[PDB]
From TrEMBL:
GO molecular function: beta-lactamase activity
Swiss-Prot/TrEMBL keywords: Antibiotic resistance, Hydrolase, Signal
NCBIfam families per the UniProt record, alphabetical: bla_class_A, blaKPC, classA_carba
Family: Belongs to the class-A beta-lactamase family.
Encoding gene, per UniProt annotation: blaKPC
Catalytic activity field: a beta-lactam + H2O = a substituted beta-amino acid
Protein's name in the database: beta-lactamase
GO BP terms in the entry: beta-lactam antibiotic catabolic process; response to antibiotic
UniProt organism field: Klebsiella pneumoniae
Keyword Cytoplasm: no
Pfam short name (any one): Beta-lactamase2
Disulfide bridges in this chain: C39-C208
Keyword Hydrolase: yes
Enzyme Commission number(s) from the entry: 3.5.2.6
Highest taxon above the source species: Bacteria
Length: 261
């Protein structure tokens, strides 16, 4: 715990880490049951919920969603570009996962019954910690002590493992989720910064409205041994802030991979 405590003391906020080696069952755990804001990291689980529905509704993924300008919100780079033609459910899911597209996330949330619908999906796979309460952009508020729109590193990692490597999704859906995570573009300074180049990573980041509150979760595939699943979440110390959240996440991920046998 000391390397994590020292990293946390240098950071000035709180860090939470859970890593599980799916080969040996060994774990690394630091503040792993505390709540941290999800921020955009809910969008990965949102895409998984879409894929779960695709087990039961044929054609869902290729179903076009025609949306108007009223659906757009800041930081929606894909959905703004296709505003003229609309986007399918699969295209919105890829945009939400790989570009953190906010309008795409809200459109998919609506499709799934809102924040309550996504929370119910997470309950259905055995996650009792996750809660989504609000939409983009309101869910980013990251008010200290507020349980809205939070989970724990352990619950995130356990749910991620079930959805990417376990039995919570059928194989084709699982592979599509893995592919979306593998193609994420927003995590190049986080967990991916901690891994050897010849491994593979799928991840989803989150960055909240307060500097110092950020996160990343990932499946990491080493060469020649079983994958690692891990989550690293931060809460800001508690305009022109300089909290080095991304470097702390990468450093924590390094310690987790180094600490496993």
């Amino acid at each position: 715990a000391e390397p994590f405590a020292k990293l946390e003391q240098d950071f000035g906020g709180s860090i939470g880490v859970y890593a599980m080696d799916t080969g040996s069952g060994a774990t690394v755990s630091y503040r792993a049951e505390e709540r941290f804001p999800l921020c955009s990291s809910f969008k990965g689980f949102l895409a998984a919920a879409v894929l779960a529905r695709s087990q039961q509704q044929a054609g869902l993924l290729d179903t076009p969603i025609r949306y108007g300008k009223n659906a757009l919100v800041p930081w929606s780079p894909i959905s703004e570009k296709y505003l003229t033609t609309g986007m399918t459910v699969a295209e919105l899911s890829a945009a939400a996962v790989q570009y953190s597209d906010n309008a795409a996330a809200n459109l998919l949330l609506k499709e799934l019954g809102g924040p309550a619908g996504l929370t119910a999906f997470m309950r259905s796979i055995g996650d009792t910690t996750f809660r989504l309460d609000r939409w983009e952009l309101e869910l980013n508020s990251a008010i200290p002590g507020d349980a809205r729109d939070t989970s724990s590193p352990r619950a995130v990692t356990e749910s991620l493992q079930k959805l990417t490597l376990g039995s919570a999704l059928a194989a084709p859906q699982r592979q599509q989720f893995v592919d979306w995570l593998k193609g994420n573009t927003t995590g190049n300074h986080r967990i991916r910064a901690a891994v050897p180049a010849d491994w593979a990573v799928g991840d989803k980041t989150g960055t909240c409205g307060v500097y110092g509150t950020a996160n990343d979760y990932a499946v990491v595939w080493p060469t020649g041994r079983a994958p690692i699943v891990l989550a690293v979440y931060t809460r800001a110390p508690n305009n022109k802030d300089d909290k080095h959240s991304e470097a702390v996440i990468a450093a924590a991920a390094r310690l987790a991979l180094e600490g496993l046998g």
